[PDB]
Amino acid sequence: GSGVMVEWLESRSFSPIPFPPLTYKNDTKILVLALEDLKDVYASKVRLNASEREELALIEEAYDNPHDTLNRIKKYLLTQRVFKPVDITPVYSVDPLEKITDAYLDQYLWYEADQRKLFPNWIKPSDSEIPPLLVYKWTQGINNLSEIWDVSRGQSAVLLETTLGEMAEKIDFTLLNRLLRLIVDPNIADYITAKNNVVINFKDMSHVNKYGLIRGLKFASFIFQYYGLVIDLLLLGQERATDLAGPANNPNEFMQFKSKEVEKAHPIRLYTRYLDRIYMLFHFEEDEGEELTDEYLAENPDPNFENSIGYNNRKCWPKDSRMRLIRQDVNLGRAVFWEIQSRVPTSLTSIKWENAFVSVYSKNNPNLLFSMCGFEVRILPRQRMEENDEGVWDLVDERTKQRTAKAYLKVSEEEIKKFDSRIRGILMASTTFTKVAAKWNTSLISLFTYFREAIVATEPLLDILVKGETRIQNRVKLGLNSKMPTRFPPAVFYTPKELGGLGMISASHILIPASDLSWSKQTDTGITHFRAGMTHEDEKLIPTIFRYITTWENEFLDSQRVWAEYATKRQEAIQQNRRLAFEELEGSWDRGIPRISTLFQRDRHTLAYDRGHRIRREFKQYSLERNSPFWWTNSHHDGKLWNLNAYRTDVIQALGGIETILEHTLFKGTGFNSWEGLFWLSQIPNRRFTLWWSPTINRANVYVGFLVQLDLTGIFLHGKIPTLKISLIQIFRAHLWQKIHESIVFDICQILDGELDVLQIESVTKETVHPRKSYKMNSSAADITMESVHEWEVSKPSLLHETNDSFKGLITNKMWFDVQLRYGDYDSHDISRYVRAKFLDYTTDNVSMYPSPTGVMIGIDLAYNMYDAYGNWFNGLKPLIQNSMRTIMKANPALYVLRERIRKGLQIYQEPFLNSSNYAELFNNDIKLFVDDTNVYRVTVHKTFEGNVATKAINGCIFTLNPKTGHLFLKIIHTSVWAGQKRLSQLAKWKTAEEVSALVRSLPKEEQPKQIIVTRKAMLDPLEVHMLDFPNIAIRPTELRLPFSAAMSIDKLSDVVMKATEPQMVLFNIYDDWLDRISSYTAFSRLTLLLRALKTNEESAKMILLSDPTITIKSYHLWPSFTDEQWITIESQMRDLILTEYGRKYNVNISALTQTESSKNEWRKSAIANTLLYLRLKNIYVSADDFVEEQNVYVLPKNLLKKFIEISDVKIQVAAFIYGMSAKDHPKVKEIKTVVLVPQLGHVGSVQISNIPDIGDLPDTEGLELLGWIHTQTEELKFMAASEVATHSKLFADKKRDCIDISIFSTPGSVSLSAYNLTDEGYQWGEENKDIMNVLSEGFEPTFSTHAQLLLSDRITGNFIIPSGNVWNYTFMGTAFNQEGDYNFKYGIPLEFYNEMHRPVHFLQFS
Amino acid sequence: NTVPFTSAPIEVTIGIDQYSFNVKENQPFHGIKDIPIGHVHVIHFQHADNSSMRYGYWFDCRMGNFYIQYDPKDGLYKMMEERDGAKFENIRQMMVSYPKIDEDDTWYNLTEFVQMDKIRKIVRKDENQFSYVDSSMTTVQENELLKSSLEAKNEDDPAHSLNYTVINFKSREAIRPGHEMEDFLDKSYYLNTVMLQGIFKNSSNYFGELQFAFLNAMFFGNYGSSLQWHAMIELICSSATVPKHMLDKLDEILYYQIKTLPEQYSDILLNERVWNICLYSSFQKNSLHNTEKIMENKYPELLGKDNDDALIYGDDEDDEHNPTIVGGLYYQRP
């Protein structure tokens, strides 16, 4: 030990890791990685505990002050050797401040060591691969060993697997320091060894840690693997280790050799170590094997042939398939281990026969066995097939491209037990049904997303899954009722949470019974039913997770494919001097490991410096008490490796769709017609869950033997279901059942009294009934009796909606009505069947006294909000009762109460929300105002590289609109309203509320709204409070996302807002005069379309409105005077724009019609577009990195940037020179004072600028340094493009090399400024490569350009120099342009790209 | 003192104060004696035949001699007062003795401020000195709001309405004209001037109604009572200006209420929104030391203190409590 490391490290020429320099290039990035990792733990949690918060606040400080922290940290590494004590619980809590230097050291070391190739290819875990992929690679690699499966000549392969016992625990600090000094600066070494040598507190005892690595330190992973390498070297020896690693100037990939002869030259073909688990694959010819065995049997004779006893084997496999204990193979196994064990001092680690498995492949042993990262693996070569379809890998010979072997997989016994204990733990806890479901789900997903196809081959695990799922169900059932149910609807378990179910994920065979697939809907015209018997489709099972996770094999084969494809696409793009666009990969984005998507994440250039990230994630087990079950993949590096959305979709569909699912719940009871998706890591309380599903849980098919009727109602209770009785009592409180009945009967009486004449009614009598009659569920009496003027001819009995009556049934002069109420359950809520049966039962009753043989039973199901009626009709009566029930069911105030209390009990949540459903009422005669407060409190933001955010308020407005008339009351909110005030975002709402109620006050009763609809929910309380004097004005929320915020994209509105100097009310018609030609409804749809477009893509939408400059906006209008025919086009264009931009964001092409909410030289187009460029100035991003005071800082005045962008072009690069001078007493601070617009010929990806302008004649030009140039571009790059380099060099190589390039990425929405220096290599290449027009070219290097430091400031202002002729844009005067020209210049105002000086004149109409 | 039962015709779970026991059809149960004379008490009923609601009678043994009698006509156990003193004194070991007072003195702590004469103004039934409550009774406030929101008027029995003090945070009573925002965000005026000084006169009477609400909520699962209890808590917590002794006394009062609350009713009783607001964001978020501790202990899930489950299925809409960002200048890596 250490001798081996010395020989190895010198053999590798290893370059020790220095102490981190004061100006360490990466120190910044290394620090953020370290702190992000430190915060991570708090990403999950909402309410912090004290120390959780106190810790977090520490890290944020560290982050908020980088370079301070760096200097603290390097100080402690340099000098600190005593430390705080460490608490343990084994998990270690290390003083928060120490952890910073420690996590910082962790990252620095892994980065530098990775750069220096310290850890050879065999050491795992590797950032290279997730663990299942290691196991796959390792099995393929075995298969691809030259001749490996040949047993022609009595060859043998041997796979030794064992654990390096107590490796961490016996680390000796003096040895460790010596070892470290071989690889790191001695001060880092001393830090590290000292940091292990600290007091550990447990229970009440503390004790100084004298030896043993403390696995909880954040750099422990590094130590542990370095130490492991010492042991690898003993096991392997220098020569074979050298064969394996390859030459340090050309290292081998894992398992790869330089030639076939080196592969075969030593019996050790392959080696790998996963932390403290070693794997060694030997190959022997028959002679070498026997040789080795005899040597072994000499030391350790086995006369009686006992060596098979205590010979570890793999029990998870069938007897024929595990290793056969043939004496020769058993002695070889023991001999291989004996040899291996002898190579390592027991002071380093304990290697014991008892913790080893040695699998021998031979002529007598056709299977090779190992266990790795939770997987049991068994390799069977085709040739040995004689000697089978689940959890199998096809092992392909790479040379022949033929399948040569199968690898069989199972989940290891240990991992089966761990999963079993997780489930038993869930059941055995201290909980909400949903929480128990969510724990089940987490465990299931954690199991499936890791073990994948291995699971289906592991029958004991399949059994545990099924038993576990049943027990989860059983726990929910027992919570629902002592008694335990006859059968139970799977909808309640497997329906997703959004629909109020537990959202369990299944692993079991679950029938969805046909009887659970019925649903119904009440329409205006009648009641429609669905049942399973009506269709001839498949019998429904609950989908199971099995089929929703792609096998590892398919992931890995597809990853090979899409990464080869990527390489090829990248090559091809480079061949055309292009960078690969992400759109070309669209379609492999969610493929690959890593996912192809990772190539285009924003944080990518930084993640590049995060090394050791795999082992770091795994070691978190030692320093955090609760960690992700997904310890083996990291989504920043790996992307997302599963997606279970199709599962949710498929379960809903299997359960019969939304319609079917909701028929099992109290949804129809709420009185909502349509699902929209609105209950609320949040749980459903058991009370609520119980209520929601009550119609399917509280029914005789689920519980029997305990049927009672709830006092004061007609509700039946089928057992003591916890919480349900009280929920229901509360819903029907204060005799609501009886009151509903009375109220409905009263309504019918009223309606009848309005039809005395039309129907020859003499009198209508409202009977008086026993107090409990409405809920006597087994007899009845008439509620209304009705006298004929003369006589009625009536039908025999028929249902309310049956259409074809014959009035030849009976003569009568007395008709009764009996209003029946019922509270249906899932089994029985067919109101048509119910009223027919009750009618026919009760009218042939000898206990129900009806007062004549002719009448009508009306029925209302209060749980399902459905109704029907059955009995005798005379002409005119059926349509009256039809219409009456239609109106009663909508309007009855007692039914209203019922539905609100149901909604309350369900915590659905109140005036009715505005909705697609009731949308149309906006345009009735009820006066209504929308209020949108979105633009009331508006700010501009300044954020510096630190994270400091200053906002400043600008003028805002209240948007109050009459959607019927188009009248817009625009209350301007001047910034003075905010002066000296605090809590402005809250004040804003109250100020809005105040201003609206004042507006309402100012209108005469005539015009005062009946309703005010607020676009945003936080306006509800303030406006209700401010509208207490107007109790009859309803304040309504809306779920609709109305696009009124985009009102400030309408110039004439912006303009009056931004110009106002005090408070002001401005009145507009936002419909202009559209209502002369169209409806309110149509005007509003048009308005909404227009504002949606402006919101979705201001520039494109304003382009559309601005196309024809002949079509203008009247002085008293907001919009252009289009024709009807033109509005049709315009509208269609905005429909497209929205959905273009929607497909341009979500990647969709074209889909289902559900809705939502001459040729050449068209410079004219781009000239209109250019007038919109100023909008992009609203978001200005400046490329920035950690201030280095050693370097210059370049200051661009705001006003010059403003003007530059205004004069630039949407497609064509525009360029100018920048001049300035260092401030007074500040050499490093270079202020830009002048931009020189120069004759130029622009292009999409480049610009021909004329040469450095001679300006010595103009005044003030004494002093002015040439600083470089500034240009627009339409590609976003992190470096100077090949064409920029070519241009920069040409300008500056021979004249002033310190000239910078300010590049401006101009795009709809924003400008992004980057400043660069160009290296001398940069300049060299530029000389060689003139007039380059592309982003790339042969020889080009991003590293040609380096970051320059750029500031914007509005404290200083600049001016312009222009060509004396005023012209600079020579697009349309190409031939006249000469780039080697010697032009003259004057101070002045640069014309815009398509000014008239720059382009062809446009013929107008002699007004 | 003693409450005899004439008999026990039907099977019923009987409660007295925080105690409970089952009685069987025609069990020889002859009532309860040695009842601690200091307090108000409640004797309550749920019939073994799950068809009944919870119902009960609040009384004070000092105010008379009271006994229970089944009424087969109405089908419930009824409290009555024995007018004839000697007649009662006539009306052995099946008369069970009320238990020895626990170490907590639980009932007193739940009823410290509760007074029979206050009960009797909330539950209005003049002829009786005891008070009948059940699960279904609405509040005068709810009854008022209904008609407000809104031939045969024929009354409801006023004795079946709980006449709790009307508390409505969005009412003219709560919000002085010209002080809309002030009074809505800080309810100190409504608490101190309108309630404490106007209606209740003192903190004892406030606490009495609060304690009575709670206990009706707990024993009867009465909706209006759980509401009233929460509203009276929220009114204090939402006030920046509260008498110091009220805050100290409230902490203890709530502590005992939450201590005695049976787990199996907590779902129904506790209001997640109110408890989160009061404890973590209100003016009095720091003031309820002992209540915060016991709540965080018994009911962390309710308070988001369950310290982490995997996003299964893999959106955002813009935020009302920030300014609308028109634009900015942003220094950052590319």
mmCIF file of C-alpha atoms in Angstrom, chain B residues 119-291:
data_model
loop_
_atom_site.group_PDB
_atom_site.id
_atom_site.type_symbol
_atom_site.label_atom_id
_atom_site.label_comp_id
_atom_site.label_asym_id
_atom_site.label_seq_id
_atom_site.Cartn_x
_atom_site.Cartn_y
_atom_site.Cartn_z
ATOM 1 C CA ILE B 119 -76.184 29.183 27.029
ATOM 2 C CA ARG B 120 -79.854 30.030 27.503
ATOM 3 C CA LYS B 121 -79.664 33.197 25.397
ATOM 4 C CA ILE B 122 -78.050 31.260 22.509
ATOM 5 C CA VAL B 123 -80.486 28.351 22.845
ATOM 6 C CA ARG B 124 -83.811 30.101 23.369
ATOM 7 C CA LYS B 125 -86.376 28.034 25.296
ATOM 8 C CA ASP B 126 -87.771 29.990 28.263
ATOM 9 C CA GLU B 127 -89.870 27.310 29.956
ATOM 10 C CA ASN B 128 -86.758 25.210 30.575
ATOM 11 C CA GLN B 129 -83.642 25.812 32.636
ATOM 12 C CA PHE B 130 -81.692 23.262 30.559
ATOM 13 C CA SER B 131 -80.813 23.556 26.881
ATOM 14 C CA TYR B 132 -81.369 21.169 23.951
ATOM 15 C CA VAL B 133 -78.837 20.975 21.112
ATOM 16 C CA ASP B 134 -78.456 18.590 18.142
ATOM 17 C CA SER B 135 -76.414 18.005 14.986
ATOM 18 C CA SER B 136 -78.846 19.661 12.571
ATOM 19 C CA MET B 137 -79.545 23.028 14.209
ATOM 20 C CA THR B 138 -78.695 26.043 12.076
ATOM 21 C CA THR B 139 -77.637 29.474 13.329
ATOM 22 C CA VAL B 140 -79.595 32.694 13.503
ATOM 23 C CA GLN B 141 -76.872 34.120 11.237
ATOM 24 C CA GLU B 142 -77.406 31.457 8.546
ATOM 25 C CA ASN B 143 -81.206 31.840 8.819
ATOM 26 C CA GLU B 144 -80.839 35.602 8.402
ATOM 27 C CA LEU B 145 -78.458 35.370 5.450
ATOM 28 C CA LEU B 146 -80.839 32.992 3.693
ATOM 29 C CA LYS B 147 -83.813 35.353 3.687
ATOM 30 C CA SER B 148 -81.428 38.209 2.939
ATOM 31 C CA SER B 149 -80.138 36.276 -0.082
ATOM 32 C CA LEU B 150 -83.833 35.579 -0.788
ATOM 33 C CA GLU B 151 -96.824 32.196 0.873
ATOM 34 C CA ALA B 152 -96.519 29.987 3.969
ATOM 35 C CA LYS B 153 -94.021 31.705 6.278
ATOM 36 C CA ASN B 154 -95.030 29.309 9.025
ATOM 37 C CA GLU B 155 -92.104 29.752 11.363
ATOM 38 C CA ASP B 156 -89.324 27.462 12.388
ATOM 39 C CA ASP B 157 -89.098 26.826 16.132
ATOM 40 C CA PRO B 158 -86.720 29.568 17.344
ATOM 41 C CA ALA B 159 -85.432 27.063 19.914
ATOM 42 C CA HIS B 160 -83.972 25.078 16.992
ATOM 43 C CA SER B 161 -81.734 27.986 15.992
ATOM 44 C CA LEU B 162 -78.414 28.665 17.690
ATOM 45 C CA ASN B 163 -78.401 32.388 18.475
ATOM 46 C CA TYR B 164 -74.643 32.850 18.239
ATOM 47 C CA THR B 165 -73.315 36.375 17.945
ATOM 48 C CA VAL B 166 -73.269 37.387 14.304
ATOM 49 C CA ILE B 167 -69.656 37.573 13.061
ATOM 50 C CA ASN B 168 -69.216 38.573 9.417
ATOM 51 C CA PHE B 169 -65.886 39.973 8.230
ATOM 52 C CA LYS B 170 -67.395 41.492 5.089
ATOM 53 C CA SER B 171 -70.244 43.384 6.744
ATOM 54 C CA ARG B 172 -70.935 47.019 7.428
ATOM 55 C CA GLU B 173 -70.668 46.140 11.112
ATOM 56 C CA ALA B 174 -67.075 45.027 10.564
ATOM 57 C CA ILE B 175 -65.949 47.691 8.112
ATOM 58 C CA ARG B 176 -66.298 51.441 8.799
ATOM 59 C CA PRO B 177 -67.002 53.456 5.699
ATOM 60 C CA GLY B 178 -63.740 55.156 4.742
ATOM 61 C CA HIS B 179 -61.737 52.487 6.601
ATOM 62 C CA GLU B 180 -62.308 49.586 4.229
ATOM 63 C CA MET B 181 -58.777 48.368 3.754
ATOM 64 C CA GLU B 182 -57.734 49.238 7.313
ATOM 65 C CA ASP B 183 -60.591 47.356 8.938
ATOM 66 C CA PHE B 184 -60.460 44.339 6.643
ATOM 67 C CA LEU B 185 -56.723 43.793 7.101
ATOM 68 C CA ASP B 186 -56.725 44.612 10.827
ATOM 69 C CA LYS B 187 -59.897 43.548 12.561
ATOM 70 C CA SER B 188 -59.017 45.366 15.816
ATOM 71 C CA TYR B 189 -61.955 47.783 15.546
ATOM 72 C CA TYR B 190 -64.454 44.958 14.994
ATOM 73 C CA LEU B 191 -62.999 42.943 17.849
ATOM 74 C CA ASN B 192 -62.519 45.685 20.436
ATOM 75 C CA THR B 193 -65.137 48.299 19.721
ATOM 76 C CA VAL B 194 -67.971 46.351 18.084
ATOM 77 C CA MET B 195 -67.588 42.997 19.843
ATOM 78 C CA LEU B 196 -65.800 43.296 23.171
ATOM 79 C CA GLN B 197 -67.064 46.755 24.107
ATOM 80 C CA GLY B 198 -70.355 46.670 22.232
ATOM 81 C CA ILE B 199 -71.802 43.207 22.416
ATOM 82 C CA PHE B 200 -69.924 40.957 24.846
ATOM 83 C CA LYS B 201 -68.865 43.737 27.292
ATOM 84 C CA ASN B 202 -65.953 41.592 28.404
ATOM 85 C CA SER B 203 -63.557 38.798 27.525
ATOM 86 C CA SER B 204 -65.282 36.253 29.802
ATOM 87 C CA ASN B 205 -68.459 36.439 27.765
ATOM 88 C CA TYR B 206 -66.490 36.218 24.500
ATOM 89 C CA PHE B 207 -64.654 33.139 25.737
ATOM 90 C CA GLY B 208 -67.897 31.577 27.008
ATOM 91 C CA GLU B 209 -69.542 31.675 23.598
ATOM 92 C CA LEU B 210 -66.273 30.437 22.001
ATOM 93 C CA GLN B 211 -66.017 27.517 24.417
ATOM 94 C CA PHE B 212 -69.715 26.641 23.973
ATOM 95 C CA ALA B 213 -69.394 26.740 20.149
ATOM 96 C CA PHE B 214 -66.459 24.397 20.343
ATOM 97 C CA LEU B 215 -68.188 21.898 22.550
ATOM 98 C CA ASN B 216 -71.349 21.811 20.439
ATOM 99 C CA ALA B 217 -69.100 21.305 17.393
ATOM 100 C CA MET B 218 -67.305 18.446 19.101
ATOM 101 C CA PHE B 219 -70.288 16.690 20.687
ATOM 102 C CA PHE B 220 -72.865 17.237 17.939
ATOM 103 C CA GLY B 221 -70.843 17.772 14.757
ATOM 104 C CA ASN B 222 -72.899 20.905 14.365
ATOM 105 C CA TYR B 223 -71.815 22.903 11.382
ATOM 106 C CA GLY B 224 -72.723 26.361 12.611
ATOM 107 C CA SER B 225 -70.896 25.731 15.860
ATOM 108 C CA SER B 226 -67.624 24.764 14.213
ATOM 109 C CA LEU B 227 -67.971 27.866 12.087
ATOM 110 C CA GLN B 228 -68.601 30.131 15.081
ATOM 111 C CA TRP B 229 -65.640 28.682 16.962
ATOM 112 C CA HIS B 230 -63.315 29.285 14.047
ATOM 113 C CA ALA B 231 -64.702 32.745 13.392
ATOM 114 C CA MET B 232 -64.134 33.828 17.044
ATOM 115 C CA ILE B 233 -60.572 32.529 16.943
ATOM 116 C CA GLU B 234 -59.886 34.200 13.607
ATOM 117 C CA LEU B 235 -61.289 37.510 14.854
ATOM 118 C CA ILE B 236 -58.721 37.699 17.672
ATOM 119 C CA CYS B 237 -55.800 36.462 15.534
ATOM 120 C CA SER B 238 -56.633 38.944 12.801
ATOM 121 C CA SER B 239 -56.443 41.896 15.187
ATOM 122 C CA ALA B 240 -53.141 43.761 15.726
ATOM 123 C CA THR B 241 -54.598 45.168 18.980
ATOM 124 C CA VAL B 242 -55.840 42.641 21.507
ATOM 125 C CA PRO B 243 -55.716 42.770 25.322
ATOM 126 C CA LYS B 244 -52.725 40.876 26.595
ATOM 127 C CA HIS B 245 -54.760 38.730 29.022
ATOM 128 C CA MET B 246 -57.066 37.537 26.184
ATOM 129 C CA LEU B 247 -54.155 36.292 24.114
ATOM 130 C CA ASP B 248 -52.646 34.401 27.057
ATOM 131 C CA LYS B 249 -56.019 32.979 28.051
ATOM 132 C CA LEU B 250 -56.903 32.008 24.431
ATOM 133 C CA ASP B 251 -53.702 30.026 24.045
ATOM 134 C CA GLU B 252 -54.672 27.891 27.031
ATOM 135 C CA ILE B 253 -58.308 27.592 26.065
ATOM 136 C CA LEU B 254 -57.418 26.313 22.581
ATOM 137 C CA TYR B 255 -54.733 24.077 23.912
ATOM 138 C CA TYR B 256 -57.283 22.208 26.035
ATOM 139 C CA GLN B 257 -59.825 22.109 23.176
ATOM 140 C CA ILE B 258 -57.296 20.598 20.793
ATOM 141 C CA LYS B 259 -56.051 18.241 23.531
ATOM 142 C CA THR B 260 -59.534 16.848 24.140
ATOM 143 C CA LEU B 261 -60.644 16.729 20.475
ATOM 144 C CA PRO B 262 -60.998 13.048 19.538
ATOM 145 C CA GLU B 263 -58.951 12.199 16.447
ATOM 146 C CA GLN B 264 -61.974 10.688 14.711
ATOM 147 C CA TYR B 265 -63.824 14.039 14.561
ATOM 148 C CA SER B 266 -60.883 16.260 13.566
ATOM 149 C CA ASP B 267 -61.508 16.035 9.837
ATOM 150 C CA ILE B 268 -64.942 17.471 10.348
ATOM 151 C CA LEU B 269 -64.139 20.028 13.040
ATOM 152 C CA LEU B 270 -60.836 21.679 12.106
ATOM 153 C CA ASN B 271 -60.700 24.269 9.332
ATOM 154 C CA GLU B 272 -57.390 24.043 7.500
ATOM 155 C CA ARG B 273 -57.533 27.576 6.153
ATOM 156 C CA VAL B 274 -58.217 29.192 9.546
ATOM 157 C CA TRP B 275 -55.649 27.230 11.467
ATOM 158 C CA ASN B 276 -52.905 27.937 8.912
ATOM 159 C CA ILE B 277 -53.707 31.648 8.757
ATOM 160 C CA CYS B 278 -53.920 32.132 12.532
ATOM 161 C CA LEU B 279 -50.755 30.235 13.311
ATOM 162 C CA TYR B 280 -48.453 31.286 10.480
ATOM 163 C CA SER B 281 -49.589 34.608 8.974
ATOM 164 C CA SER B 282 -52.039 36.517 11.233
ATOM 165 C CA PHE B 283 -51.091 39.329 13.664
ATOM 166 C CA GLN B 284 -51.182 36.771 16.463
ATOM 167 C CA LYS B 285 -49.033 34.125 14.710
ATOM 168 C CA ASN B 286 -46.473 34.345 17.494
ATOM 169 C CA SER B 287 -48.895 34.533 20.382
ATOM 170 C CA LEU B 288 -50.297 31.004 20.778
ATOM 171 C CA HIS B 289 -47.223 29.193 22.014
ATOM 172 C CA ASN B 290 -48.851 26.114 23.564
ATOM 173 C CA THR B 291 -51.541 25.749 20.881
#
